[PDB]
Design a protein around this ligand. Structure first.
Ligand SMILES: *[C@@H]1O[C@H](CO)[C@@H](O[C@@H]2O[C@H](CO)[C@@H](O[C@@H]3O[C@H](CO[C@H]4O[C@H](CO[C@H]5O[C@H](CO)[C@@H](O)[C@H](O)[C@@H]5O)[C@@H](O)[C@H](O[C@H]5O[C@H](CO)[C@@H](O)[C@H](O)[C@@H]5O)[C@@H]4O)[C@@H](O)[C@H](O[C@H]4O[C@H](CO)[C@@H](O)[C@H](O)[C@@H]4O)[C@@H]3O)[C@H](O)[C@H]2NC(C)=O)[C@H](O)[C@H]1NC(C)=O
Ligand SMILES: *[C@@H]1O[C@H](CO)[C@@H](O[C@@H]2O[C@H](CO)[C@@H](O)[C@H](O)[C@H]2NC(C)=O)[C@H](O)[C@H]1NC(C)=O
Ligand SMILES: *[C@@H]1O[C@H](CO)[C@@H](O)[C@H](O)[C@H]1NC(C)=O
Length: 499
């Protein structure tokens, strides 16, 4: 079949991130040294150089803010982040160069709208490997709005915070760009990895894999080595949208297990609406959000992972409630804070007469809050033949179809039914005809019809339905591909709306 494609114009200039404009269908593909804007049918429009440029990783503060007495080199710019900012009609993009430059581009032509100041803190991270940084832009009505950002900091606990909320202001001209939402001597909208922890655990860092806006909160999904073989722990991090002091912080481990085997290494995630099936399963409305995630076996070697992988669903209501009860108890003197990487010691929960209302936003006591009581997600599908890499979901006609990418370059189409079944992988499709890993990022067309899927050197527009393959009614209504109805006055298997 003749799928739409976009190859990398270069052997070195590989793809990093991807996103689609949900109203115009422009395909923005962040890549090494480039940030291409494409059209719906993946035909090249605006190429955009971001690299390479002269730089050196040892230079801090970065070359942009001062000359540095080091041997410079022609260093590459890896696209670490790529969020469309819908409210202010602009793209945001960050890179590995000059200690983590963020540039606000323009949607129309990718022309640099705003350079951030030459204040060294406006630069985010010297880390030049992908899938360690994620951001969420939150512009709830009334204020200028902000960027919540988390990133790996490669041992420089002084230079870059692990997670912070920056100002992303209305006036594109403004110098306020990427200043901390708050910055006094002590209280600030940033969390820094203490030196104590970086000593006590060798190459200690926190990789951020996904983040999302949900209701009154911002959530970040983080993988890290664990305080005393190599023990890794995937987590959920939750902050109030309106909290500058960062007092609202609370962090719980998460994972899912099926058939005695347990999966606790987050490889991907993706927020979406719940199935009809899945909605009944979690006792949520068909409004509320469900986070779909992928996990590896155990908690061993995140850097060299196995093959046993598992898709699972977490309804936000469960997270929001498992947190609510964690806070609850801790506010009645029960247990400890239990967050040893950031606290560096044991801190006893303070019993306080404070009601933990449905959306409570922290005080200066019992924070930051942790926990050692995993948030268990409902498994939907497993395998050990192929490793799973990416995840993306949506709801067609009550049925939640979930798409999953593989190490071998395959996209599975799983329909989620919930207990006791879980999910039925109704169809597989080989996207990359050589067996190239699919990358964490995947997104739909404006009107659901396609899903953009990408490897290091490829981007392909794969359609959701291909019911054509099903020739007879006995094969059509047999596969369980929720799109496919058998057609009357046509005598073929296709989608509902075109019949
Ligand atoms: C989503 O939410 C729903 C709704 O909240 C939830 O379903 C409830 O689950 C809870 C907790 O598991 C159940 O509570 C248990 O109830 C036990 C007794 O239940 C019987 O009695 C119910 C009331 O009967 C009265 O009203 C009916 C009118 O319908 C009338 O005819 C009767 O004569 C009587 O007056 C009755 O509704 C219920 O019957 C339904 O449910 C059964 C399945 O259980 C189903 O097969 C039937 O078809 C029917 O729809 C049933 O006959 C009770 O003994 C038990 O108490 C123990 O545990 C608690 C908590 O640990 C202790 O406090 C207690 O001391 C005992 O140890 C428990 O409270 C509740 O029955 C369910 N409600 C319904 C409507 O089904 C789902 O779980 C949620 N879904 C998911 C996926 O999570
Ligand atoms: C990320 O930066 C590192 C530098 O720290 C790069 O690794 C270097 O690669 C060159 C060859 O291109 C070698 O000569 C050096 O020995 C490497 N240095 C170190 C410290 O390992 C790496 O290539 C960069 N990655 C990307 C994707 O650009
Ligand atoms: C894709 O469609 C566009 C119109 O948006 C057209 O200009 C372009 O030529 C098409 N590309 C290919 C590769 O056929």
């Amino acid at each position: 079949p003749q799928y739409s494609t976009f190859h990398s114009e270069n052997r070195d200039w590989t793809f990093n991130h991807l996103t689609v404009h949900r109203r115009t269908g422009a395909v923005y593909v962040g890549a090494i040294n480039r940030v291409y804007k494409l059209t719906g049918n993946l035909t090249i429009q605006v190429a955009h150089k971001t690299g390479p440029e002269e730089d050196n990783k040892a230079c801090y503060p970065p070359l942009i803010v001062q000359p540095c007495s080091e041997v410079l080199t022609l260093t590459n710019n890896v696209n670490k982040l790529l969020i469309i900012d819908y409210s202010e009609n602009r793209l945001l993009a960050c890179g590995s160069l000059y200690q983590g430059v963020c540039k606000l581009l323009r949607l129309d032509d990718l022309f640099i709208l705003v350079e951030p100041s030459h204040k060294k803190e406006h630069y985010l991270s010297s880390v030049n490997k992908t899938g360690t940084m994620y951001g969420v832009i939150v512009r709830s009505e009334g204020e200028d709005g902000k960027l919540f950002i988390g990133t790996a900091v490669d041992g420089k606990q002084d230079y870059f915070p692990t997670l912070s909320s920056r100002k992303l202001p209305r006036d594109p001209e403004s110098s306020a760009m990427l200043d901390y939402e708050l910055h006094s001597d002590f209280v600030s909208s940033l969390i820094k990895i203490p030196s104590d922890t970086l000593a006590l655990v060798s190459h200690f860092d926190i990789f951020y894999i996904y983040g999302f806006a949900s209701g009154g909160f911002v959530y970040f999904l983080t993988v890290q080595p664990e305080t005393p073989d190599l023990f890794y722990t995937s987590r959920i991090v939750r902050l109030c949208k309106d909290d500058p002091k960062f007092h609202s912080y609370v962090s719980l481990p998460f994972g899912c297990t099926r058939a005695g085997v347990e999966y606790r290494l987050l490889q991907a995630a993706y927020l979406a609406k719940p199935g009809e099936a899945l909605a009944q399963a979690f006792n949520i409305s068909s409004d509320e959000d469900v986070l779909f995630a992928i996990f590896s076996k155990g908690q061993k070697q995140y850097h060299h992972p196995p093959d046993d992988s598992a898709l699972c669903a977490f309804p936000i209501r469960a997270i929001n409630l498992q947190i609510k009860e964690r806070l609850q108890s801790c506010y009645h003197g029960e247990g400890n804070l239990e967050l040893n990487w950031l606290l560096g010691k044991d801190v006893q929960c303070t019993k306080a007469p404070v009601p933990i209302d449905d959306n409570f936003c922290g005080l200066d006591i019992n924070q930051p809050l942790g926990g050692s009581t995993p948030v268990e997600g409902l498994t939907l599908y497993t395998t050990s033949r192929d490793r799973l890499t990416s995840v993306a979901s949506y709801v067609y006609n009550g049925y939640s179809v979930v798409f999953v990418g593989t190490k071998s370059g395959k996209l599975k189409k799983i329909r989620a039914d919930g207990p006791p079944h879980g999910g039925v992988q109704y169809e597989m499709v080989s996207v990359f005809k050589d067996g190239s890993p699919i990358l964490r990022d995947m997104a739909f067309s404006i009107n659901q019809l396609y899903l953009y899927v990408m490897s290091e050197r490829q981007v392909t527009r794969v359609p959701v339905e291909s019911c054509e393959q099903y020739t007879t009614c006995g094969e059509c209504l047999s596969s369980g591909d929720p799109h496919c109805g058998w057609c009357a006055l046509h005598n073929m298997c296709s989608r509902r709306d075109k019949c």
